[PDB]
Amino acid sequence: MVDAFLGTWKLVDSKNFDDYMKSLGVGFATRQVASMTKPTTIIEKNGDILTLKTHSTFKNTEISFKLGVEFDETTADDRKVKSIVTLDGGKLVHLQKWDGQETTLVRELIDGKLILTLTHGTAVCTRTYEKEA
Ligand SMILES: CCCCCCCCCCCCCCCCCCCCC(=O)O
Numbered sequence: 001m002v003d004a005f006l007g008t009w010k011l012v013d014s015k016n017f018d019d020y021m022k023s024l025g026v027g028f029a030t031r032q033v034a035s036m037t038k039p040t041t042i043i044e045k046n047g048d049i050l051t052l053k054t055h056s057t058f059k060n061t062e063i064s065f066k067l068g069v070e071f072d073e074t075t076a077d078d079r080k081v082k083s084i085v086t087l088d089g090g091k092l093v094h095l096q097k098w099d100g101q102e103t104t105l106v107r108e109l110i111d112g113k114l115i116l117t118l119t120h121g122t123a124v125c126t127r128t129y130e131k132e133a
Pocket of ligand 1: 011021026030033034041054055056059060076077127
């Protein structure tokens with residue numbers, strides 16, 4: 001069910017990521033470096049455990065989870081959140097909750113590209129990744 005998401009993905013387009021980071025309270029210097037990084041996202045499965053790595057010259061992260069089971073997460077910007085990832089409409093939907101706040105990280109495949117939509121507050125960001133062979 002998640003299998004077309006698996007693999008190594010490289011960032012090839014970003015829209016409104018500064019808006020998203022600023023909504024989350026990320027400081028200007030961090031937003032500045034993040035606006036020029038191009039992460040690699042690696043999505044691997046082992047049985048029903050998924051591991052999602054995000055690698056860059058600035059910040060690395062890694063999470064492991066089962067679909068539909070809440071997990072603790074510490075984000076790249078150091079928020080301690082309660083997370084859950086599920087498949088919804090063929091999209092991989094990651095919801096983070098903290099301090100009564102929420103943000104969603106939604107991944108959808110369109111013409112072989114992975115489109116990540118990041119929503120917090122009113123800010124909506126769309127990032128596009130292409131597979132690596
Ligand atoms: C988990 C993302 C880590 C790699 C980040 C790229 C280099 C620096 C960015 C981190 C800056 C703090 C803002 C983080 C906000 C939260 C996660 C955004 C992930 C975006 C993506 O996966 O394309």
